Amino acid sequence: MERIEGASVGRCAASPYLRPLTLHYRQNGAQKSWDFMKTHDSVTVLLFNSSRRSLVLVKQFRPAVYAGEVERRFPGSLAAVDQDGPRELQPALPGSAGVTVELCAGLVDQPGLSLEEVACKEAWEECGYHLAPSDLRRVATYWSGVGLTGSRQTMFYTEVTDAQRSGPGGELIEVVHLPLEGAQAFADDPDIPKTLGVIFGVSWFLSQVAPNLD
Amino acid sequence: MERIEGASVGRCAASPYLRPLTLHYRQNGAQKSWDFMKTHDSVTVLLFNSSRRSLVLVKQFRPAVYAGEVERRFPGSLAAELQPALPGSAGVTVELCAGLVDQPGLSLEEVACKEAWEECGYHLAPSDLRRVATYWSGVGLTGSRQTMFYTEVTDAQRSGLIEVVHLPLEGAQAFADDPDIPKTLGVIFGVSWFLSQVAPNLD
Ligand SMILES: CN1CCC(n2nc(-c3ccc4cc[nH]c4c3)c3c(N)ncnc32)CC1
């Protein structure tokens, strides 16, 4: 997975996910405008494999994050693309720089689907776990962009057994069974690039669900 | 504050907060590309006014959120000017005290005590602040880091259009949970974390 070659940044003109806009409005009398983007809602899922006493997460490379780490470590690298085409990434960091630990997640695009379905979908696709929309329990709903994106995200949790997990042996995204003993320590450790989701999830599970179990 | 007129959605060409890009790369052999934006890092602060036994938050209108709520409630509205008519109260969010990490150099703490002064009217010293967590916010389209800090306050540091919200602790939990209030995961985590971590070891 963690093998990325020939990173090059190019200027984006059209994109389905992008679609930036400007909102003009008179606040408290004063006429203003704001720059933001039509971006997609999303759903996240926490799995607890009761049979293994582990939590289920997705470690994967994120390009956004990778390019983010390159900008910190070599500023200006993300100078505006003004060329015949893409700029090559001059100091190119290891693939392991864009690699994040996250909750199982996905966009809310498919027209109609109850969030739960979009959840059980990602839970199948990403983790290889069969889920039923009745199994899922709403944890929280909140906004992610606020600044540049008015996107909602909804979070769900459900318990699983090895009976719902089945995968063959013939790998874009890693699956991460986090054993519960180490869960807390793991969340805290700043060496691991994670989302607040991840941190909240573990934090929440341990406080809310963990005590009322075997 | 919550008074917004003449909402219209408009095509953006240039922006100080935009600069989207496409990253071309060969992963595991396979050539791919991703759409994302050069965006700034950020810092957030949780204040606990010990004197009032309240937590300190910022309620403000966010245009992004407002337009987001209009799209949920009337899809396609964001087809490629348009007048929603939805109330100003639809873009109004409760958030942690927050700011960009733009000013070149500043130790995060300073950017924190800055926003804490500017937004909440609370005097803060970088020594007061306690790192809570660091994590990524965009992941999808951004890949920006955010750092979160917490510190306790007394009415003695508070003396200084965004609202300030003293959330009393009794109601804090219920408040976080309630989906009627547009909030960030920050907000949710903050309350969640404070109650579990700090609240028990106090009077
Ligand atoms: C099976 N295919 C699905 C679409 C692919 N994809 N997915 C995203 C993406 C993923 C998550 C989020 C969250 C907010 N915006 C997002 C965008 C994305 C992007 N920004 N550009 C190009 N291709 C992208 C990945 C592989």
From Swiss-Prot, chain A:
Record localization: Cytoplasm
GO BP: nucleoside phosphate metabolic process; protein N-linked glycosylation via asparagine; ribose phosphate metabolic process
Record's keyword terms, sorted: Cytoplasm, Hydrolase, Magnesium
Cofactors demanded by this protein: Mg(2+)
Nudix hydrolase domain: residues covered: 38-200
UniProt keyword annotation of NAD present: no
GO molecular function, one term: ADP-ribose diphosphatase activity
Biophysicochemical property: pH dependence: Optimum pH is 8.0-9.5.
Intervals of motif Nudix box: 111-129
InterPro entries: NDP_pyrophosphatase, NUDIX_hydrolase-like_dom_sf, NUDIX_hydrolase_dom
GO cellular component, one term: cytosol
Domain of life: Eukaryota
Cytoplasm among keywords: yes
Function of the molecule: Hydrolyzes UDP-glucose to glucose 1-phosphate and UMP and ADP-ribose to ribose 5-phosphate and AMP. The physiological substrate is probably UDP-glucose. Poor activity on other substrates such as ADP-glucose, CDP-glucose, GDP-glucose and GDP-mannose.
Family, similarity comment: Belongs to the Nudix hydrolase family.
Name of this chain's protein: Uridine diphosphate glucose pyrophosphatase NUDT14
